[PDB]
Amino acid sequence: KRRKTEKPSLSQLKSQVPYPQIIEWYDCDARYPGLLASIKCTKNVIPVPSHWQSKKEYLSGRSLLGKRPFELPDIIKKTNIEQMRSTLPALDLDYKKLHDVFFKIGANWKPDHLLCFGDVYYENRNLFEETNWKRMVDHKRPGRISQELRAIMNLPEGQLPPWCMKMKDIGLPTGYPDLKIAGLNWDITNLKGDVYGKIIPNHHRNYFGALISFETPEFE
Amino acid sequence: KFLDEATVIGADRYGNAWTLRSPPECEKIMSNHDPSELSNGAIKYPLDVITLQQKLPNTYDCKFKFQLLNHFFVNDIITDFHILDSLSNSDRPGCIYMGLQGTVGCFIPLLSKGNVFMMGNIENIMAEADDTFYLDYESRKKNN
Amino acid sequence: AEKQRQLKLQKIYKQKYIGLGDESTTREQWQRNVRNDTLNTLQGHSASLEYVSLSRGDLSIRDTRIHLLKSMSPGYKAYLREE
């Protein structure tokens, strides 16, 4: 009773904290709030996954209904057993082939997503969309437009995007000062296919561990 | 100390000898950008980094993290690391350390692979070698 | 039954290994375990013991060791105060 009503306000607790935004309303009933704020707000600690205080047993997810059953890592998919055995609703294989797939072909191979120091998987999360996202931030760059989005845009080949004219009056993108586009800052004769422009960088090892040779263990 | 631009040597008060490396995601950014734009100005960080800033501001405040590269435990407390481009004209540059309780030891980067493959297999042998002797000595007791 | 066994193993592991936070443990009880284990390792490794000896600058090293031993008990602060 008295101890329950003795609690300091969470904002009174914020001042003790160097990173006050992590502390939350429920920290008021922390039996040792001044300590718990220091631990929770300590540098490298990773806050408890928030699926607690929910009674849903951490997975009720509607998204769980729409998750793909599985996908082979493409290196293993090269092994062709996908066609040999149909998992969806005998296939003689070579020892050298499989062994080389894991070792010769797949030594340097690593899953593309993984996760980071403090990455924690909440129920509603799905990594796959973020994998295509990270891969997409990689492939796609300004000045280039795929033929699909080009067809939807109804832009014929050899013709500049509609924002090149408004970009002539307004100016180059503030975010891309080094961006070049045919007809304006960049040679129109170099206009080719899906690329109407490219960023021209103005910036222009061994890491003590350079192996200088790569030799995998041989099965034979 | 520094081995390189992107990697660091460090010891512990408790005797850990480790080496860390900045992630390639950071090396690309600093290689492709000027430092003046880091504090203020436009530097485009992938979506995950920012979400780690608002999600975990305490750990990711520095917006990158060292992936552990090498870790080791030498029961001494290392006083001085020195990175020598060559040890007695040897090609592979070593790093030699003197410990407080006194010791001097080295970490030699292994070129190629089957160097560390053969070394790794020998270390794996000598690791449980006492157990292999115990299992042989056990089987001979089963026969006797 | 299973949880009930985990209670008994809680009593046994707590007996052997001393401080193990069960469910509710006061910060005074737990922080004492922290201090005791940290000092325990500082004096336990001849390495870190040699280190603290020099950085502290004591005349002998066993002064630092038995210092940590004494520093394990709470009343040692008031003991130093009474010197």
Binding site: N108 | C106, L110 | -
Partner: peptide
């Protein structure tokens, strides 16, 4: 892609000199 993965080879050149324990017995003849 080349894996960085620095492979370090630890050697103790000179062995720890602070002598923490001793015994007086006669071991080998």
């Amino acid at each position: 892609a080349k894996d960085d993965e620095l492979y370090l080879y630890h050697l103790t050149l000179k062995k720890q000199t602070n002598f923490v324990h001793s015994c007086i017995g006669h071991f080998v003849d």
